[model samples]
Target: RVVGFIGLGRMGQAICRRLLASQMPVHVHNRSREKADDLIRQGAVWAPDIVALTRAARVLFVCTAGSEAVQDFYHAPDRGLLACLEVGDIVVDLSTIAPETAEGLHAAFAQQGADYIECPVSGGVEGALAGILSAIVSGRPEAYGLIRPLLEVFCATVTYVPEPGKAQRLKILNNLAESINLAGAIEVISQGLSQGLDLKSMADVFTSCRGRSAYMDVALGYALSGGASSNVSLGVRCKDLELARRRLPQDQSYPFSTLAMTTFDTVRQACGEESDQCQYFSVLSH
Candidate 1:
């Protein structure tokens, strides 16, 4: 069956490329057509609009910025993909969305005999390009069976949950770790620099030894150069952190993650939304 993709941002485009690499005939639609130019040249079909893509492809994947975008794409009146799907079709969302968002989409699709799979991914753009991202999935058995092979093409790890909202919960917690560790890494560098530790040496030693982390290896060593730009924008990071914090029961207190969210919030306000996430190091660059 042909596959359809929406949201051709950095991670989205990378995942699209991996699917194309598996020799699948991919159909893609993005808000910006120019963002999809490379994918089209690589032999993937470009669906000019949402309804058109849903009609031609049996399984559609969404990797949008967040819940709001997902709602617009799936909940719009005539322009929505949900309006265009046939019975027995499926939507496998790879976006990091709110648990409520996942639950709503699942219910909406189930009503039409179509399926919704909450399958948010981690490991960033490099992992997507290398076909090694980790996917946390939750859905019915039949839908999982159909989408498993397709997911395996681009994800090295595929963990299934007993229900839909749970996967999104796990993803939010996972990204919460990434945010805190990212903050820690930046603070470590800030302190080391103050004490006259060499930047590369600090990175090499910290990553090679007990301080090692995915955040260190990928963001610090790879993306977090003194002045380099990051594809993971600060705005996106702020949103994820906010989602994680907001999802907590209001009666519960989460001081640490709340502080982490505030850190990114302050950075976005000070540095502007366009700054990459790794540039949060700038928070302590003084």
Candidate 2:
């Protein structure tokens, strides 16, 4: 089956490269025409627009900014993918979005005899490039199986859930947890730096013990080395944390997640919406 990919951000570009490397006939569409250049040079076809991309491939992969972009890509009155998709086509969304939005898209696609899989991905850009990203997907079993191999092209592990929105729920919580972990690590690193200890040494020590974690090793350590910047905006982290908090019951206490939200909110206010999420590391020492 022909594969269509939209969104050519870092992660999207890596996924496109991996799919092409796997010998698939890949078609790509991105808002910036120039971003599709390298992929086109590698024997991948570049579609001028979403409708053309949709008409050329049955299985479409979406890795847009978030829910709004994904929605716009599908619901555009004249030029969206939905306008050109046929029965039995599938859209596997790798974007992180609200669970409710995933459910709505599933219903919308069902009406067209097409399928939607909320296949929110983990592993960041590094994993995408290495072809070992993880995906938590929720969709009909038949649809899940149909796209399982396609997802495996770039994903190391693909977990499927039968429900329509669980994957998004899992992804939201996963990101919230990552934010919290990274923020907490930043606090520790700040303390260490205040005492004149090296950030890398401190991270190495903490991560060698019970505190060892993905956040400490990757997020905090990378920040120390000037590599902690994220494609995900600070505003996006705050937004995801808010969504995570909203998903919880009012009476239930998740203090870390709450603190995570406050931390991201404060950073977003101070640094502006476009700042990378890791930009918060800069203010932690102050």
Candidate 3:
């Protein structure tokens, strides 16, 4: 009944620590062995490979960067985790990936009696450490029920969505809203400064107004830290906006997502450099 986790990045490390502190028997694996060593020192077992990790655990969580790595590790012909998993096991994916692929991954796992749940999460690294991330889960309701406690180790809200990809779609949809807010804050602050109001005044005003949002704090903080300049690079913003657009129906264009993408493009122009992913937020300032 031990739980296993992979992907030992910032968020992954936070999750592992929470599980370990709760005294869960956790087997760990990551691309970097050192990332798993902290847990190893705290009485967690390190998986020599995906096979070893998945075979011994009742449930395994996947928290890779995105779906590409998920496919690379879980579907590799010679070394994927699938080879070592069996029925009654669960694969909980907490990555942001396209909704279209979950059903196929699930069908493959079902042959061996495994459950694949798409459990995309939000709240960033800070939220991960605080155990207050929001997770939107998909798959059988009971499947989520089986692992509900473990999820509590890293999240405050655990909402269940219907179907294999529904959760991811909804998570993506929510992200669209945040991205739009990010762009709006950036533009408002920048334009306010251009018209004679100080940047800090504009930022403060937004903080006190109905426009206050999760993105405003970090973005405005970054901007102020750089003397009214934020290096939030543009590539990431454009990509998320495009990801939203890709999810939209082909017959009808999504103007909002398109505008977000275009805004990031303009921000890229201001930086005079290729877009860094974080700079996507730069769209606001530009």
Candidate 4:
């Protein structure tokens, strides 16, 4: 089956490269056609537009930046994928979007006899390049079963959540936890620095103790190595926090998450949106 991909950003490009490496017949399209050039040269076919891409493949992967872009490509009246979807076409979205949007897309695509699965990924660009990312999948069971082998091309773990939008909700919650944990780790590292402790030594000590966390390793590794060159940007982190906040119930209070959202948003404003998340270390430190 010909697999189609849209959105050739850092994550998307890594995924497409893996598919091409595996010798899958891949069809690609991006708003910036230049982004797909490398893939095209690697034996993947290129489609001039979304409609063309949709018609070219049995399963299409949409990995755009966020909800707005996902909505535009899938919902636009004239040129969107919804208008051109065949009865059994499968659209596996790897973007981290709002849960409501995921469910709505699922319903909209089902109305036209297509399967829309929310399969947001985790493990960063590092995992994408390594083909070891975890995919939080949710949609029709048969649709997921059909795509499981393809998902294994890039995902080390493929978890099925069953509900239409639960995958997106789980991804957002995971990101929220990650942001909060990273922020707390940075706070301790900043204190350690103020006391003249060697950053690497502190990292070593923490890794050997209960104080260790994946975020601790990430923050220290990035900080000691002159910040991350390629990882999730502060802008995306802030967006995920916003998504988390939007999902909170009115009857419940979540001070820690609120604080994390505010803290990350502050860093985003100070460091600019495009800055890598590792820059949070510098911004939060003295």
Question: Each model's TM-score?
Answer: 0.95, 0.93, 0.83, 0.95
Model 4's number of clashes is 0
Could you give candidate 1's per-residue lDDT for residues 218-271 as a string of tens digits?
A: 556643455555568887888789888787687878777888888888899888
lDDT for model 2: 0.84
lDDT of 4: 0.88
lDDT tens per residue, model 4, 1-286: 7999988888898999999888899999898999988888888898998888877788999988877797679878879899888999999999999999999999998999989989999887888888999999999999999999999999999899989899999999999988988888888888898889988789889889998887777777776776656477888888899999899899989999999999889889888998887676777753
Can you tell me which runs of candidate 1 are displaced by over 4 Å?
A: 222-226, 250-252
Clash totals for all candidate models: 0, 0, 8, 0
Note the residue pairs that clash in candidate 1. Answer: none
RMSD of 1: 1.6
Q: lDDT for every model?
A: 0.86, 0.84, 0.75, 0.88
Pairs of residues at least 3 apart in sequence or in different chains that clash in candidate 3:
186-284, 232-278, 232-279, 233-279, 233-280, 234-279, 234-280, 236-277
Candidate 3 C-alpha error for residue 150, in Å: 1.0
Ten contiguous residues minimizing lDDT sum, candidate 2: 221-230
What local lDDT score does residue 155 receive in model 1, on the 0 to 100 scale?
A: 91
| Cα distance off (Å), candidate 4, residue 74 | 0.4
- Among the numbered candidates, top lDDT falls to 4
